[PDB]
Amino acid sequence: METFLFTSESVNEGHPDKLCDQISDAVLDACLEQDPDSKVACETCTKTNMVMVFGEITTKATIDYEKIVRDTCRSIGFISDDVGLDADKCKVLVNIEQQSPKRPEDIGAGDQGHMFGYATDETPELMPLSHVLATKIGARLTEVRKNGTCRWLRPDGKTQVTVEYYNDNGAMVPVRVHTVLISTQHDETVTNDEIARDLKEHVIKPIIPEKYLDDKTIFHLNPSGRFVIGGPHGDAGLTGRKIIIDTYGGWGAHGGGAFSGKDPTKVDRSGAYIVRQAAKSVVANGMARRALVQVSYAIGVPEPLSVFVDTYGTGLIPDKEILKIVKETFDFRPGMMTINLDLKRGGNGRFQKTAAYGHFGRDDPDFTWEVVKPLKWD
Amino acid sequence: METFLFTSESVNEGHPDKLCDQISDAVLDACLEQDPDSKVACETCTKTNMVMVFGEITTKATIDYEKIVRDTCRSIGFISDDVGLDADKCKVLVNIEQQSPKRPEDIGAGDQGHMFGYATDETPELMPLSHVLATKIGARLTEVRKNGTCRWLRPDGKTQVTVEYYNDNGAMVPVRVHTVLISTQHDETVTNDEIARDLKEHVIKPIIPEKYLDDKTIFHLNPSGRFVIGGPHGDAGLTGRKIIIDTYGGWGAHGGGAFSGKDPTKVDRSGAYIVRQAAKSVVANGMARRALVQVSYAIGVPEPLSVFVDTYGTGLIPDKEILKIVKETFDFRPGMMTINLDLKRGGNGRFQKTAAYGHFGRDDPDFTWEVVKPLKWDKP
Ligand SMILES: [Mg+2]
Ligand SMILES: [Mg+2]
Ligand SMILES: [Mg+2]
Ligand SMILES: [Mg+2]
Ligand SMILES: [Mg+2]
Ligand SMILES: [Mg+2]
Ligand SMILES: [Mg+2]
C-alpha cells in the first residue's frame, strides 16, 4: 500500500500571535453587541509587558478598549509576569482611530482579493485529519489547564501532527498517525516524566482515535526542554499571523486574507466563510469526497470576478456542473453573504470563539457557515 | 474546450503591510551586513503617522533603527502627509529587544512548523501565470513611477489577474487572461481617462503577453474611483500579512510562516526557500510538469519530521521515487540549508529585495533558491 506523510500544526490560545487574534475579535464582538453595523479593522500587537490595539473602527458603540484587552488577556491566563504577561499591570496602548458613521444586493466588495473553501470526507466535520488532530490537541491542552486536570500547564504552547495517508482515487484516507509533537508552557511543579505521562494519557490518547496510534507512532513531548515563560515575554505577536491554523492546516488553499479583527462584511472573512459552506455542502451532499472552491472580488463590485470548483477527481458529476450548482445555490455578493450567514447577530463572544482552535469544522451554532445547504442534482 | 478561472493578486511596495515587510527585511539586511550570525525576528507595524519596530535581535551590529525605518519609507516614496506618510515627520517607535550573543549538521530547528514549495512548467520561471502577471504588473507600476514614465503615480496600489486555464493531464495550460484589475494610488494632476490610458499602454500592454489578451478580456481600472492618499494613513500595516503574495498566489500550498524580518536560520524562511528549490528542480529536470513539496520540523531536532512530493499526476516516474531522489539530493537540516543557499552573505539589500513582488520566480543571483540542482534519474 503506497502512502505519504502530511503535517499540520496548531498553536494554543496563549501563543502571542493567537492572543492578538483573540483581542482583535474581542474588540469586534464588543462593537457588534452595541452596533451590529460597526465597521471594524482592529489590529493587535504584543511584546514584553505591552499590548497595542490599532486600526480603524466606524461605530456608534462606546467601547472600553483597555478593559477588553485586559479582560481577554486575564481570561486566557496571563495573570503574572512569571506566566509571560500580567493582564492587570502591563502597558496597554489604545491607538485605534474611532469615528461615527443600502440595498444589500448593490453593496460592492470593500476590497479585491480571493478566498478558498475546502472540505474532505475523511472526518465527520469534513476537515483534514492532520489539522483536526493538531487543533483538538491544542484545545484539550487549554481544557485540562482550566479544569484542573493538569494544573501545571501554562497558556502558551504548540502542537503538530503528521498523518500517513492513502490516496483513494483522489479521496484522502488516513492510515495512521506517524508523529505527534507537543511543546507546552508549564510551571516549576512538574517533572519532565510527569509532563510526558500527563500529555500522553490526559491530552493525546483522549483526542486521537486509538485506531490511528500504534507502537511505531513517534512522540516528541517538549523535545527542546523546559518551557516556563511564554506568551509575549521576550517575543512578539501580531494579528493575522496564524492564517493556515485558522483554516485548513496546509490542505486546500489560502487567498492570504486574515480573519480576526474584521467585521463580517469584509470579503476576507465572509467570502472565506461562504466558500467553506459551499465546499462542505458539495461533500455533505455526496456530490464529491473532496472539494476546493475559490471566489475573487474587485473593490466596489458586488458580483465575484471568478469562481472555481475542483473535486480532485472525486466528483460524481463533472466539476463544470458542480460550479453551476454552487453558483445557483450560493450568493457571493457581500451584502447578501452577511445576511445569509447571520454574521452581525453578535451574541456570546461569537467571533472571539473563532480566534483560537480554528474557524472551520466546529459544530457550535454560531458557526453558521458550517451548516450544510441542500444542493439540487437529481 | 473545458476551462476554469483561477485568480491571484499582488500589492504594491507602498501597501502598508508590504511597507512593514520591507522595513523588517531592511533591519535584517543591516544586521547581516555587520554580523552574518545575527539572530533577527523583527516585526513592524504602522498606522497614521507612525511606524513601530519590535521583536528580538541578537547581534554584534550597531544599528541606527530609526534611520533604517525613515530611509526605507522615504525610498518607497513616503515623502509627504499628502501621499499618506512622511518619512521626515512620522513617529518612529524603536521597541526592539537587542542583545549581544557548532557542527552545522547537528543544529536543531529553532521551531516547529511546515513549509511548501511549488513549481509549474506554465511559465519560463516555473511559476503560476496568474501570480506572475499580478506581480509583474505591480512591479511595473513601481518602475514607471520611479523612472518618471508615469510621474502621477503614488506608491500604494493593488493588482489582480484572473487566468482561464486548461487541465492537460494535471499540467496547467493558460488559455487567456480573463480579467485584469488595477487599483493604484495617484496624484491630483491626472484625470480618470489619463489614468486608464496610461495603465493600458505603459503598464498592462508591456507586461501581459499579447497571445493571452483578446476583445473579451475584462479590465477594471480604479473601479472604486480616485485613490490619492494611501499607505498607513487612516489604515494599518503589519509584517507577515501578505504571505500568499510572497509565495504562489493561491497555487501550491502554504504552511503559515511569514518570511520578512527573520534571519535565514529560521526554518519558516530557509525551509520554504529550499522546498521552492526542490520543486523547481523536479520540474526543470523534466521529471514532472508540476510539483508540490512539503517539509516539517520539530524544535530542537535537525532532521525534518516529514517530507512529501506530489506531481499532480504529471510525474514521469512515481512520486515515491521522486521523493527518494529529492531526499537524496537536498539537505533539509537547518544548519545546512543556510550554508547551501549562502543566506548569511548579506550584500546590497539582499532580503529587502524579496520583501515586495514575491520571494520566488525572480532571476536575481541573490535569489540562490531559484538555481536549479541537477537530479539523477532515468527517463522511462
Ligand atoms: Mg509569530
Ligand atoms: Mg514563537
Ligand atoms: Mg484584507
Ligand atoms: Mg492588511
Ligand atoms: Mg531625531
Ligand atoms: Mg487595505
Ligand atoms: Mg514562525
- Let me know how many helices (H) and strands (E) chain B has, helices first: 8, 13
* CA–centroid distance, residue A235 to ligand 2 (Å): 7
Q: Has B43 been annotated as catalytic?
A: yes
Amino acid at residue number B311? T
Distance (Å) of CA A17 to CA A20, A235, B29, B156, B256? 5, 10, 24, 26, 12
* CA–centroid distance, residue B302 to ligand 6 (Å): 39
Closest Cα in chain A to B307: A5
| Helices of type H across A35-109 | 65-76
Nearest to B278 by CA among B154, B126, B131: B126
User: What Rg value do the Cα atoms of chain A yield, rounded?
Assistant: 21
User: Which distant-in-sequence residues (6+ apart) come within 8 Å of B96 by Cβ?
Assistant: B27, B42, B53, B54, B55, B56, B57, B65
Q: Provide φ and ψ at B224, rounded to 5°.
A: -95, 5
Strand B50-58, strand B91-99: pairing? parallel
What's the CA gap between A13 and A237, in Å, rounded? Answer: 12
The continuous run of DSSP H or E covering B84 comes out as none
Helix-, strand-, coil-residue percentages of chain A, each rounded to 5: 30, 25, 45
User: How many CA within 13 A on the CB side of residue A13?
Assistant: 27
For A16-106, the fitting CATH number among 3.40.718.10, 3.10.310.30, 2.30.130.10, 3.30.300.10 is 3.30.300.10
Q: Provide φ and ψ at A285, rounded to 5°.
A: -85, 5
Cβ separation B256–A243 shorter than 8 A: yes
Q: Are A84 and A232 in contact (CB under 8 A)?
A: yes
Strand A218-221, strand A171-186: pairing? parallel
Angle A68-A74-A79 (CA atoms, 0-180°, nearest 5)?
145
* CA–centroid distance, residue B32 to ligand 5 (Å): 25
Q: Has A17 been annotated as catalytic?
A: yes
Count Cβ atoms below 10 Å from residue B105 Cβ, excluding itself: 12
Closest Cα in chain A to B99: A234
Cα A185 versus chain centre, distance: 21
Cβ separation A244–B236 shorter than 8 A: no
What's the CA gap between A20 and B73, in Å, rounded? Answer: 26
Cell 500547564 locates to A153
Ion ligand 4 contact residues with beta carbon within 5 A: B 17, 241
What's the CA gap between A365 and B2, in Å, rounded? Answer: 39
Solving technique: X-ray
State the resolution, in angstroms. Answer: 1.5
A8 neighbourhood in chain B, CB within 8 Å: 114
Q: Is B348 exposed, middle or buried (0-12, 13-18, 19+ CB in 10 A)?
A: exposed
Q: Are B41 and B262 in contact (CB under 8 A)?
A: yes
What DSSP assignment string belongs to A210-238?
GGG--TT-EEEESTT----S-TTTTSEEE
Q: Is A327 exposed, middle or buried (0-12, 13-18, 19+ CB in 10 A)?
A: middle
Candidate from A97, A242, A307 with C-beta closest to B48: A97
Q: How far is B189 from chain A (nearest CA, A)?
A: 23
What's the CA gap between A117 and A323, in Å, rounded? Answer: 13
A242 neighbourhood in chain B, CB within 8 Å: 256
Q: Are A35 and A179 in contact (CB under 8 A)?
A: no
